[PDB]
Design a protein around this ligand. Structure first.
Ligand SMILES: CCCc1c(C(=O)Nc2cccc(S(=O)(=O)N3CCCCCC3)c2)[nH]c(C)c1C(C)=O
Length: 127
């Protein structure tokens, strides 16, 4: 019941690239979700200690959050757009796994997920 270390946000060994799709993911997709009213629960990694959820990291073995995703884009962690899209999807999947239907957190996640899918459908053409 101690928090795990947050996911890695910068790796010296990995090669670094800037693409329009990556610009769009940080600049449009991340920013739109970050500004949203329901954003706060997904803005940082779930703090199991502070929120007193002992079972959360036993159930969820691949934690992800928008704060982490924002840092990865900002640190040029992702070579590919799909890597970032996968992280968004993992964050939503985690919420649904841990939480029951009708929970406030699940409803918020669905709204964010819905908006995310709309923006991702507008993803710019790759190089
Ligand atoms: C049962 C919901 C728990 C949860 C959050 C969450 O963030 N909930 C939260 C609740 C209360 C306050 C704050 S908080 O942001 O205001 N806050 C101040 C309090 C103590 C430190 C923490 C930060 C955050 N997000 C996800 C994805 C989940 C789960 C389990 O799926």
């Amino acid at each position: 019941s101690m928090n795990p270390p947050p996911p890695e946000t910068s790796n010296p060994n990995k090669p670094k690239r800037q693409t329009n799709q990556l610009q769009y993911l940080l600049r449009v997709v991340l920013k739109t979700l970050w500004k949203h009213q329901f954003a706060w629960p997904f803005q940082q990694p779930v703090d199991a200690v502070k929120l007193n959820l002992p079972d959360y990291y036993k159930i969820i073995k691949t934690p992800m959050d928008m704060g982490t995703i924002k840092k990865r884009l900002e640190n040029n962690y992702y070579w590919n757009a799909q890597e970032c899209i996968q992280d968004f999807n993992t964050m939503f999947t985690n919420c649904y796994i841990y939480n029951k239907p009708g929970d406030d957190i699940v409803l918020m996640a669905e709204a964010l997920e819905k908006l995310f899918l709309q923006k991702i459908n507008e993803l710019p053409t790759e190089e």
